[PDB]
Amino acid sequence: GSQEGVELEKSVRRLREKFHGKVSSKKAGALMRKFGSDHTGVGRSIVYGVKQKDGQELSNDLDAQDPPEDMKQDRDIQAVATSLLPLTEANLRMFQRAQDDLIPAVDRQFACSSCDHVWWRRVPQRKEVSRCRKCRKRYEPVPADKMWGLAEFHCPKCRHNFRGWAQMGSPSPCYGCGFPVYPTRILPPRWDRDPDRRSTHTHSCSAADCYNRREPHVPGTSCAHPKSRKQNHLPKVLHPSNPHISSGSTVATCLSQGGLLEDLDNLILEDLKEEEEE
């Protein structure tokens, strides 16, 4: 796959997302060809306009930055800055983040019921949405208190610590003392972390359900691991994402995914391929 395509699309997406999608793709594309994918500097240049064209005390809460004169004088940048007025108390933190080259972000879990597809994605804090890669529909996150995966347990009674595949809000029995322990959190699968965070990792459980049950087992418990789920003919998805209803300002995934298993350049490349066909 040609990287210069992935990187062009990445930088149009990043310019847009720093303006919460209020800059168009056709316009971002032009800006990114003409200025060599420099979303940071285009972005900084737009905010300079807004600060300049705004007459409120609010615009002193924006930094005054040096815009390349070929950007300061560009009429398409300037028209964008106008198109984004006015500057409001509800607008102002968007514009600050844009000039700080900042897209605040969060790792979230996602679950497409009809694909029975679960995945993780680093998404923007302003719009925690990711697209199912099997069926191409956008979904909202699984709620924090319903997430499942490799979980960390800290028994409050005896201080045994253990790791295991599990869902939030569902106690497991402490292997130490038998009292019920709720998971503290879920750890996403990551190539730079312990492989026990992967579903591919060998798993053994005290649940009666378990595809690979530990002994002694606990008689009325059910295992969250997808192999167990499948073996018991249950859907791998324990708790589906609500489908996301598009409001219009969404920007497709342009965030670096860190050590999550699905990296960004491949996500974008598959996106560009899908478009070639259509």
Instruction: Select from 2-10, 53-61, 99-107, 147-155 the region that touches Zn ion (CB under 5 A).
Output: 147-155
Under the binding rule (CB under 5 A), the answer on residue 135 touching Zn ion is yes
Instruction: Select from 36-44, 121-129, 199-207, 235-243 the region that touches Zn ion (CB under 5 A).
Output: 199-207
Under the binding rule (CB under 5 A), the answer on residue 158 touching Zn ion is yes
Q: How far is CA 245 from the centre of its chain?
A: 17
Give, in order, the Cα–Cα distances in Å from 139 to each of 5, 205, 240.
26, 30, 9
Under the binding rule (CB under 5 A), the answer on residue 144 touching Zn ion is no
Under the binding rule (CB under 5 A), the answer on residue 134 touching Zn ion is yes
Under the binding rule (CB under 5 A), the answer on residue 177 touching Zn ion is yes
> Cα–Cα distance between 151 and 111 in angstroms, integer?
17
CA angle 51-49-94, nearest 5°? 60
Instruction: Select from 42-50, 90-98, 124-132, 192-200 the region that touches Zn ion (CB under 5 A).
Output: 124-132
Under the binding rule (CB under 5 A), the answer on residue 132 touching Zn ion is yes
Is 122:105 a contact under the CB 8 Å cutoff? yes
Looking up tokens 């073996």 gives: 231
**104: preceding bond cis by omega (within 30 degrees):** no
Is 21:14 a contact under the CB 8 Å cutoff? no
Instruction: Select from 64-72, 103-111, 132-140, 142-150 the region that touches Zn ion (CB under 5 A).
Output: 132-140
Q: How far is CA 163 from the centre of its chain?
A: 24
Q: Exactly one of 71, 111, 142, 223 binds Zn ion (CB under 5 A); which one?
A: 223
Residue 173: how many other CB atoms lie within 10 Å? 17
| Identity of the residue, 169 or 176, whose beta carbon is nearer to Zn ion in the bound complex | 176
Sign for the CA dihedral angle at 50, 52, 55, 57 comes to positive
The size of the interface with Zn ion (CB under 5 A), counted in residues, is: 17
Q: Exactly one of 22, 72, 160, 198 binds Zn ion (CB under 5 A); which one?
A: 160
Burial class of residue 250, CB neighbours in 10 A (0-12, 13-18, 19+):
middle
| Identity of the residue, 134 or 185, whose beta carbon is nearer to Zn ion in the bound complex | 134
Under the binding rule (CB under 5 A), the answer on residue 112 touching Zn ion is yes
Residues that bind Zn ion (CB under 5 A): 112, 115, 132, 134-135, 155, 157-158, 160, 174, 176-177, 205, 207, 210, 223, 225
